[PDB]
């Protein structure tokens with residue numbers, strides 16, 4: 001069951017400020033929608049509270065220690081271990097804590113690199129391309145509504161081989 005990270009981060013790996021995306025970029029929300037519709041998003045509780053409602057047309061799974069959590073349209077899990085039981089293509093959708101927890105465990109990552117420097121208070125963990133093969137790299141198209149340069153990366157973990 002393919003396990004992927006799904007994230008947008010800026011040139012300094014910022015992913016959030018005051019529990020919201022620091023950028024306004026409609027084409028990347030379209031990207032997220034295209035990739036995850038019909039599949040599963042796993043997210044930590046703050047990320048979920050940030051969006052406020054489940055994203056439509058896909059399974060929303062929320063990781064929390066709160067056994068009181070029960071939101072309509074949302075499935076709850078209480079540990080990381082539960083992620084590996086989830087059927088199908090599972091995307092780790094945030095936030096900083098969950099990415100830190102999962103970056104060493106996922107098969108691959110769909111990263112939108114936001115090609116600017118924003119003020120942030122939450123970050124994606126450092127990673128090196130030494131470890132990740134660029135399966136694809138696609139420059140986002142800019143327009144009136146989408147004015148920050150950005151790049152769609154699909155990265156796949158490199159195998160460790162002798163020599």
Ligand SMILES: NC(=O)c1ccc[n+]([C@@H]2O[C@H](COP(=O)([O-])OP(=O)(O)OC[C@H]3O[C@@H](n4cnc5c(N)ncnc54)[C@H](OP(=O)(O)O)[C@@H]3O)[C@@H](O)[C@H]2O)c1
Nearest residue numbers: 007008015016019020044045046047065094095096097098
């Ligand atoms: N740029 C992007 O693509 C993107 C995408 C999504 C989110 N974000 C940003 O990320 C930020 C939030 O990140 P964050 O790290 O502060 O919060 P987070 O990871 O979204 O939520 C953390 C919460 O998840 C629960 N949790 C995490 N690990 C757990 C475990 N092993 N077992 C049980 N529960 C666990 C805990 O909830 P309880 O405290 O309820 O137990 C924890 O407080 C927001 O600013 C958001 O905008 C960015």
